[PDB]
Amino acid sequence: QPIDADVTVIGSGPGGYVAAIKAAQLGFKTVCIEKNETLGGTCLNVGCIPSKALLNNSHYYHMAHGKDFASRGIEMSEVRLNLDKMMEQKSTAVKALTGGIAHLFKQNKVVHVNGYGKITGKNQVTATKADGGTQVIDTKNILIATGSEVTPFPGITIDEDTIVSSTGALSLKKVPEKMVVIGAGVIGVELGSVWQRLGADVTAVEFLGHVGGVGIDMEISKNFQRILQKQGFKFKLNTKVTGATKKSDGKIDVSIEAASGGKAEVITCDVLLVCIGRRPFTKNLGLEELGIELDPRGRIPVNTRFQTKIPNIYATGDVVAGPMLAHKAEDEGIICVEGMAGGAVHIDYNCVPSVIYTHPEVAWVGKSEEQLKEEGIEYKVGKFPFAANSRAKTNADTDGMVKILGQKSTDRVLGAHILGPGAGEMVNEAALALEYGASCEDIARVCHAHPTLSEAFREANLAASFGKSINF
Amino acid sequence: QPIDADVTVIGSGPGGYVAAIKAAQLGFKTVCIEKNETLGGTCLNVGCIPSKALLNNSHYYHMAHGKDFASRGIEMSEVRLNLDKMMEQKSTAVKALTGGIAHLFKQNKVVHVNGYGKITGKNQVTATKADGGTQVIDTKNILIATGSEVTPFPGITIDEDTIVSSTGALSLKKVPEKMVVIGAGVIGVELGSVWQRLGADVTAVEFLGHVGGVGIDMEISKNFQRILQKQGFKFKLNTKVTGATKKSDGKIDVSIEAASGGKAEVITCDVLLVCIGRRPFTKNLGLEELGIELDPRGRIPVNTRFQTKIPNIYATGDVVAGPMLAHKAEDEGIICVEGMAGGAVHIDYNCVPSVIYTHPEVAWVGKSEEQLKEEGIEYKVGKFPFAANSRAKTNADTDGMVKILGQKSTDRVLGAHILGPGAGEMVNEAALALEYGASCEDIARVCHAHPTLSEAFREANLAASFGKSINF
Ligand SMILES: Cc1cc2nc3c(=O)[nH]c(=O)nc-3n(C[C@H](O)[C@H](O)[C@H](O)COP(=O)(O)OP(=O)(O)OC[C@H]3O[C@@H](n4cnc5c(N)ncnc54)[C@H](O)[C@@H]3O)c2cc1C
Ligand SMILES: Cc1cc2nc3c(=O)[nH]c(=O)nc-3n(C[C@H](O)[C@H](O)[C@H](O)COP(=O)(O)OP(=O)(O)OC[C@H]3O[C@@H](n4cnc5c(N)ncnc54)[C@H](O)[C@@H]3O)c2cc1C
Fold it and tell me: Best label site of A83, A313, A320, B168, fewest CB within 10 Å?
């Protein structure tokens, strides 16, 4: 009647669903508990996969509705948007990738239980399904992958109809004629670009003086904001939000002020997206009874082998500290279940890439010029514009640069920052180079194809090691 | 007018113009000679850059003139083609990239002499313009970057109007109702897909039984063929050409025969593309006088320092052996002039990547399954479909795979073969890996961002190291 297992994973997010497959392949009789009807967690159901699809489709619309396709001799008339099919394709891809996780849990002999899991004891988790029936799992180890949730703004309640979160902004029924986005982070900037390409008047408000979020280079952030501001993205940065009111007009009066409070304006929008961030989700789990406290932000503190104060209970993902990105949770899930099977658990979050999937794309691996200034590390700067990269000018996407930072003495690649085309696929090369402890010269002396956008990466590294690049 | 110089470079091709800039940066009084009106060589004026530009715009057209855009809700009414605007984007990019080399040549203080170069002496080069001063360049070292030319077809005279080659096919005024391409290699497959997307009955005739030329993996070339055949491409592999006639109608009859015998057919077409291959160019160079004999293929025999029989005379590029690729010539040009400065010259023609810039893309590096069996090496195979990659299923590019080959004992990556989206930029990661001598497990344990097409590279390496993949 109960389930006896070795590793029980509370969560089907990226950190959890991978760890279940991995632990299953390593011999561990694995069990995964998921509360939501669909598997995949945020990234699949209401996260990376939906946002990327609309980002992709919105760009192709903005190209047809703009001079882009006519510039290349693709002359069309009456370019119109059927948001239904665009949202349908988003749903079709999410639905298809939900079924992938199911097929994987099936062929990799993982047991799925559709309930809300609470750690009843040090070696048992009880999951309450929607019917009220409880499935008691008795397990040797327990992995906490409860994931994350949206941080609510004080004084505003997301109704997911006109005051929406990321969840609602991925399923808007018609293009808002005006949209205000609180939070110029990754999700905010991305989602704002999707709807603005479809005709929305998007203005993003941020208390901070930079767009992008934590970990972006100041030079990259500024140049990124400029290109977006010329695409139609209006940015009210250094601006504090005071309040909001769901007018009887159907619209939402948004009251804003400066961080100092000097200028007090009020803007009005058809749709308000609150994207001030996300936070660790640890509700109704049983951590207080187990006597494991959280940290100030609400994260479960862990060690190198990713276990809490109770050793047989492990925790990975957005729940624990570190960059709340999908691939990070995946890795953490892999190293953790390998540490359980006997392995050297070592992950370097400095080699963790970050990708803004806008167009222009922003993507970086390593330390910013400012992070190194704080740490006192003296460095060199190498830069190659995509205006001088061959495949860019052949494709006409000649916006942005690749900035390579390297220590003066060691020439070691400290950080890499890419603004422009194909930056997302590019950082995975800079990631491999960072893991291999490469220098700027080490990359420059590698055969890079022609014509590719990777040549900007090689030549920017060359601009650091040699001082001068070839084609710039 | 004599020109006292340190290093004189004959040819503005990729191997020449890069080495001229590099040698000038190394301190040499570098001189470059070009017989044509524009710099850049074959790749920039009549090669990679123009072919890639049309491939980009033509793929964009085929998406609109089909179902791709409307599948995502991007609904246009009537799609037309202004070919005299697409060819302009091709020309505008080539012109801009040509002017780039000019500014760089002037920046690094390289002497551009516009004449036909011939080696009058061991330390003397004389260039004859069509009419001019017939400049003498007394130099210490001489670099032969004389390049390549269109290998002709015996029995077929290239008209460049209806009997076109790489050049003429890139500058056609109208779309042929039916086009026939001789040579199903890289250049053939690429340009054939350009006009097929633009509306043409394109058939490719090949003596060999594989597309993509020499080096491509059998399974990859075969799978590439299947997809190309669903996109309208027609392939007459294992078929020899026996004649071509220009009729008074202006059409061309092609006399084809099954190489073994029989299956003799006549093919009428509007335009004939002859791109069976290319051969080095050593014409009117003075090598016979100097005594530099050539191998049977007409290439210049060079040593590891890329010297000819006479040391001060060096040769690099398509004029020497190795794959006829521009990034090969670029690297060969750099390491050569650095060998003059005293640096060690080392080059591995296995870490040289090959990319077919079609949709779907083909890009590989290392050894094929056939080549590994030809050298008696036992290997593991790892595959990951792009149909399982998150970013591909998101962008609806669920076509192709990544194949990883690693020795059954050392697990060292021996060949990485990519068919599908983003292969052109993804392959440069495998180049860095092979240069760093990585194993399948080395790449698999590196953080790859989500969602990126690079995850297919990681997962395929895992499918060869662990045997099983996470998401497949
Ligand atoms: C709009 C948006 C776009 C994003 N884009 C990107 C991007 O491009 N790249 C990127 O790297 N990251 C992106 N992210 C972030 C990424 O989605 C998250 O970092 C990651 O998915 C969270 O990993 P996780 O498994 O720890 O959390 P989750 O995915 O939230 O996993 C938790 C899962 O477990 C369930 N659960 C929780 N508690 C219990 C319980 N007690 N019992 C049973 N089940 C439970 C939850 O319902 C959920 O399904 C994006 C996020 C959003 C919101
Ligand atoms: C359609 C097409 C697509 C291609 N795509 C790719 C691709 O994607 N990637 C890739 O790597 N390669 C590609 N190539 C091949 C690429 O163009 C060549 O491999 C490369 O350009 C040759 O290098 P090189 O240094 O010999 O330059 P070349 O251009 O071959 O060198 C010859 C140059 O020297 C000049 N010259 C010749 N004789 C003299 C003389 N006596 N005096 C002065 N100057 C002289 C010529 O005018 C020319 O400018 C493609 C080729 C074609 C036709």
Answer: A83
